[PDB]
Each structure stands twice: as C-alpha cells, then as structure tokens.
Structure 1
Amino acid sequence: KEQTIFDHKGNVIKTEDREIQIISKFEEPLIVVLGNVLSDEECDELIELSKSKLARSKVGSSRDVNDIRTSSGAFLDDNELTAKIEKRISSIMNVPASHGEGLHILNYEVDQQYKAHYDYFAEHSRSAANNRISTLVMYLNDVEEGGETFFPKLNLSVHPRKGMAVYFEYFYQDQSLNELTLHGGAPVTKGEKWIATQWVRRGTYK
C-alpha cells in the first residue's frame, strides 16, 4: 500500500537551514501542525514583498499583465528569499519545489469569510490532469481573535500563530479521504490574518 507523501519519522524535520517541529497530526487524511517553519523576519518580509509588488502593478504601469487581476497577482515574484523558503518547504512536503505553484500571499480582514473548499480541482477541470496533491499554509502574523483554519467534516481547527503552518495532503486513492480535507478560514473578529500558501502539483509545474 502506497504510504503518505509526507514521509517524516520522529518529532522534528531537519531541513538544510531550519528544524521544524511536528506538533500534532490528524492521521487520515493527513493534516499536520508544524512549528518554526518560518522565522518572524521571513514572515514580515513575505508580507512586505506582497505589498510592494502590488503597489507598482496598477493600470498604466508597464508590467500590469492582465492575468494578475484575475487572479495571479497574489503569487510573489521569484527572488532569493522565495527560493530559500520554497527549498525548505520542499523538504517538509517531500516534493520538489518545481511542483509548487509558488508562494501565494493573502490577507483576511475582520468579518470576511470564504466558503469551505477543496484545494484540488474538479475532475474534467483544466487542472485535473496535473492536479494539486498537497498544501502548506503558513501563518505570517498573530491574530488576536478568530482566523482559525477549520476542517468542517473533521471538526478540527488549527489556530493561527506566527511562523507556524498546517500541512495537508489529498492524494488518496479513496476519494472520500480527499474530500475530508474540505477547509476554510473562520472569520477574523479582532486583528487581521496573513498567510502564505504553497500548492503542490502531482507533476512539475514550473
């Protein structure tokens, strides 16, 4: 029987540049809370990179490619920081960084809510052939109240904490296990919430 993609024994993941803590696991589908994934400074820098990229990509600017408004503008431009972090993430996720879509940065304001959703795409969808297989959500700041990552079919919540992350995979043969990774963010009620996400495809993506 094919084992989980995430393949780590023990209570830490030793990456080239950082020791990540394995905090807790829901065992099937695999959902893993991870500590110390990003430094505080790295969290702050990813937020700043997202803001500065946006401030200079408006209408009339030279590089306002149309697709960035619908809706790829949340992916960071490549630089030495994003390469460093994607390399670390690849050790955590056991999949080369070439399979990653790249660091996607998003913020949630008070009382905003998304529906719970799946991260993988629908069958016969455009991305079905080389679908997403696993996700890493990195919390880039502390949230005074609300903002939990909630898995409603499992009744499991992961609360945001700067530098912490939640990993989950949905590449199971039994499709019901993949559907149990349905998830959304509980509303922020005090503060704001910043996350970086790495979505990993079955095959190479970039």
Structure 2
Amino acid sequence: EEWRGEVVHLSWSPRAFLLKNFLSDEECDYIVEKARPKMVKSSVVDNESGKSVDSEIRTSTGTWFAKGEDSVISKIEKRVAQVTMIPLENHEGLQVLHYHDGQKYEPHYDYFHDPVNAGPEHGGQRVVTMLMYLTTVEEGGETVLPNAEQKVTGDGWSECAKRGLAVKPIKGDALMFYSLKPDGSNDPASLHGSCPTLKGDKWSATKWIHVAPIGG
C-alpha cells in the first residue's frame, strides 16, 4: 500500500522522479528468481519474411507477469498505484527484463505497446512509466533520457549515458517518468533508453500506466 521514502526530483523536462528504496531487496530477488526460468531473447516478427527475428532495438531477454499474478507481486502493484496516484485498472502487468554482456534498449517512447514487449497487446495511451531496478549494475546499464535539459557529465558514466540525463540502476530504486504532459499531450522529452550493460547483470521491471482502464 502507501509508501514512505526519499524521492529525488531528476527533471521537469521530461518529468522524472527517482524513488529511493521503492522495493525491498527481498522483493527484487523474488521477481528475478520468478522471472529467470521464463526469460526469452527479445524478438519481433519481421514483416517482409514473416519470420521471428531478434530485435535490434531491445536486445535484453524478457518476460511478463499478469497484473495480480500472485500475492507478492500484487502488493508491489498496489504500491505503484499509490505513488503514481493512478488506479490499478489502468496498469499493465510487470514487464521483466535482463540485460548483460552489452545488451541495451535503444531510445524510444513508451506512448504505446511495442511488438517487442513480452505478453499481451494492450491498446491505449501510457501517461507514466515506472522502472524498478532489481539489481545494482557495476558498469553501463543506465537509463538515459537524451532529450532532457541537463545531461550527466564526468567519469563514472558510460559514453551512452553522457548523451542525456541518466540514472544508474541501484537495487530497489524506481524511476518514475511521464510520457505525457499534465494536459495529455505528448512530451517529446520523454525519449528514453537503456545504455548497454557493460559489467554485471541488469534486471529491471517496467510498469506501464495508461490514461484509461485497460481493455476491458
């Protein structure tokens, strides 16, 4: 339910907020261990040939959990609803990803479902995304926002990260960022990616949250 913790304001363009210690270590491990045997390489069906091929855009492995999948996930899902102030009926289920060994997600918008996403196709417009880091990544793996106002600088950031505002994955933290402005218009500043993971293993769980109930 209701969560009490440190929020770091990252940006107004796009609106981005870092929720410190949003998940416990135990919850992070639970999701990773539940997801692990289910992970498959990110793939899309190539239109021309009509064949399944590895995505060149999201090169992680991936899976999904249904909203309300089980009790432990359900609890987190209610917490996500509380901090975003948007009811559960508008939330997709968890998208779990694992990147390592150079794997990335090229910058894109979360405005709509993408064929690369594991799980069902949900029509509808996302307003907000929550990205929950399930592991701490030693090198690379930053979530980068290239159209943000203030780029990150200095040693300790991957070259990819220095192309925008960037967030280092730290176990238990969650990045909340808005794809739409408060008036429902698109925010082009919400372009975001996952910089290649260079050392370690990046596990993340994404919650995509719509302006209106999913389906139903």
Indicate whether the TM-score tops 0.5: yes
Letter in 2 for 1:171: L
Selected match of 2:83 from 64, 76, 92 = 92
Are residues 1:104 and 2:95 paired? yes
Find the aligned partners of 1:204 and 1:141 in 2 and give their Cα distance: 31
Shift of 1:75: 1.4
Unpaired runs of at least 5, structure 1? 1-14, 56-72
Can you list the C-alpha shifts for 1:132-175, whole angstroms capped at 9, x where unaligned? 11100000001111100000111200111000011011222484
The residue that corresponds to 1:62 in the other structure is none
Can you list the C-alpha shifts for 1:62-115, whole angstroms capped at 9, x where unaligned? xxxxxxxxxxx7111400011100000001111011211111100111212222
Selected match of 1:144 from 138, 152, 155 = 138
Can you list the C-alpha shifts for 1:11-60, whole angstroms capped at 9, x where unaligned? xxxx53x42211223123210111010000000000111124459xxxxx
Letter in 2 for 1:121: F
Find the aligned partners of 2:128 and 2:72 in 1 and give their Cα distance: 22
The residue that corresponds to 1:194 in the other structure is 203
Tell me which moved more, 25-34 or 42-51.
25-34
Report the aligned-residue RMSD.
2.4
Unpaired runs of at least 5, structure 2? 41-61, 114-120, 149-163
Are residues 1:74 and 2:74 paired? no
Selected match of 1:47 from 32, 41, 55 = 32
Are residues 1:163 and 2:152 paired? no
Identity of aligned residues (%): 37
State the number of aligned residues.
170
Instruction: Return closer, same or farther for 1:54/1:186 CA change in 2, 3 Å cut-off.
Output: closer
Find the aligned partners of 1:100 and 1:161 in 2 and give their Cα distance: 24
| SS class of match (1:48) | helix
Find the aligned partners of 2:208 and 2:184 in 1 and give their Cα distance: 21
Q: Is this contact kept in 2: 1:136–1:199, CA < 8 A?
A: yes
The residue that corresponds to 1:25 in the other structure is 10
Find the aligned partners of 1:48 and 1:110 in 2 and give their Cα distance: 19
Can you list the C-alpha shifts for 1:117-143, whole angstroms capped at 9, x where unaligned? 000139xxx966x21111000000011
Q: Is this contact kept in 2: 1:109–1:193, CA < 8 A?
A: yes
| SS class of match (2:80) | helix
The structure where strand makes up a greater share of residues is 2
| SS class of match (1:81) | helix
Are residues 1:132 and 2:126 paired? yes
Find the aligned partners of 1:75 and 1:202 in 2 and give their Cα distance: 21
Are residues 1:35 and 2:57 paired? no
Q: Please report the TM-score for the alignment, with normalisation by the length of structure 2.
A: 0.72
Q: Is this contact kept in 2: 1:53–1:76, CA < 8 A?
A: no
Find the aligned partners of 2:130 and 2:70 in 1 and give their Cα distance: 20
